[PDB]
């Protein structure tokens, strides 16, 4: 891998690429990509019954957070939390969007 084993993190995907990628509705399919509209942050796209939910990820002080209450040290641990429980997600993570 790039730096371990984080394929779910594309770090370079467009709206058209993210839309088609999440074509088939399957609760648990998530994907992270560099926020286009907001440079410097990330966006998590999940498929909930065919709907694409985008979760803005704020990166400050070398820490990530979406609820502005739970800060992490990296995207790896961040996903682990959202995978074990919703934590504010329409559907807990189940299968990472492998690219």
């Amino acid at each position: 891998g790039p730096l371990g084993s984080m394929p779910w993190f594309h770090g370079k995907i467009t709206r058209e690429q993210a839309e088609r990628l999440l074509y088939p509705p399957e609760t648990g399919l998530f994907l992270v990509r560099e926020s286009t509209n907001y440079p410097g942050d990330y966006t998590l796209c999940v498929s909930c019954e065919g709907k694409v939910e985008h979760y803005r990820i704020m990166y400050h002080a070398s820490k990530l957070s979406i609820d502005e209450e739970v800060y992490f040290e990296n995207l790896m641990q961040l996903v682990e939390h959202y995978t074990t429980d919703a934590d504010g997600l329409c559907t807990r993570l189940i299968k990472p969007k492998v690219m």
Partner: peptide
């Protein structure tokens, strides 16, 4: 539905529009 749009296709989007295309943490 949710039609997301990046500044690449719509650079005339503001926090209001961009954020409007997000769900945000909703326990």
């Amino acid at each position: 539905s949710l039609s997301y749009k990046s500044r690449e296709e719509d650079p005339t989007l503001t926090e209001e529009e961009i954020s409007a295309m997000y769900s945000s943490v909703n326990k």
